Ligand binder design. Structure first.
Ligand SMILES: O=C(O)Cc1cccc([N+](=O)[O-])c1
Ligand SMILES: [Zn+2]
Length: 257
């Protein structure tokens, strides 16, 4: 099934998911010179004080930190959005080396990794219904550069040994995602898609301008994860990023001058 090898990676996905060649696919390259400042954009409202993390899962593609999304406890609002979007999970994409790993690029620059905080529009009731709608999801994307450690990341890094292989989970309560945010909430936004199959065109992307810094040691621990299941040939979970897709008939808008 789909993955990130030679035989099953991004360049193959269209055969099972023809929307891979669609009009609003993600990620994209962000051309900072052509993204226009939109004064009508609002500040983003990230309200994570009541967030309830529950579990961390290796799904064979990344690891997900899952939240209780049965009430409006961690929500994203404002920005480009109408209405309220509940946090369901976050996950990352990363490289085999520090010079690649992000999905979005900035003037063709690849970051070492990219964090995706996935939220669904409460007007649709549940995640599965929301992904069927063009305004169903809001994904907050945050770039990771290698430098100083991110203290708030370390709890995640240190549990990864317990979820080495596909289908492993571990309890992961009381994790505060605020510790993964940069200082500024300046952002770019555009309409796009899930970046893994089924590649549904249901996402308002909000990509923060300011990266977070993580240490080399932190990203090295991401790269010890496995795509494979327990006792299968080990294949390191690295390069689990989809490359930039054609922008087509879209505009990327900036919240900032
Ligand atoms: O790979 C999946 O399981 C599908 C999926 C589910 C939730 C968010 C997603 N995203 O692209 O941000 C993709
Ligand atoms: Zn993602």
């Amino acid at each position: 099934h789909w993955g990130y090898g030679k035989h099953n990676g991004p360049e193959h996905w269209h055969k099972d998911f023809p929307i891979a060649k669609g009009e609003r696919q993600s990620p994209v390259d962000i051309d900072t010179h052509t993204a226009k400042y939109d004064p009508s954009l609002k500040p983003l409202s990230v309200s994570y004080d009541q967030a309830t993390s529950l579990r961390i899962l290796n799904n064979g593609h990344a690891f997900n930190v899952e939240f209780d999304d049965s009430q409006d406890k961690a929500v994203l609002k404002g920005g480009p959005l109408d209405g309220t979007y509940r946090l369901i999970q976050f996950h990352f994409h990363w490289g085999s080396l520090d010079g690649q790993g992000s999905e979005h690029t900035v003037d063709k620059k690849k970051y070492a990794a990219e964090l995706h905080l996935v939220h669904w529009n409460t007007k649709y009731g549940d995640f599965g219904k929301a992904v069927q709608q063009p305004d169903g999801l809001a994904v907050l994307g945050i770039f990771l550069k290698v430098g100083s450690a991110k203290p708030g990341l370390q709890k995640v890094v240190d549990v990864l040994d317990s979820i080495k292989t596909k289908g492993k989970s571990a309890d992961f309560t009381n994790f505060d995602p605020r510790g993964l945010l940069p200082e500024s909430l300046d952002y770019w936004t555009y309409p796009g898609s899930l970046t893994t199959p089924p590649l549904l065109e249901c996402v308002t992307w909000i990509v923060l301008k300011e990266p977070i810094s993580v240490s080399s040691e932190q990203v090295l621990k991401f790269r010890k994860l496995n795509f494979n299941g327990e006792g299968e040939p080990e294949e390191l979970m690295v390069d689990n990023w989809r490359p930039a897709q054609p922008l087509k008939n879209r505009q990327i808008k900036a919240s900032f001058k």
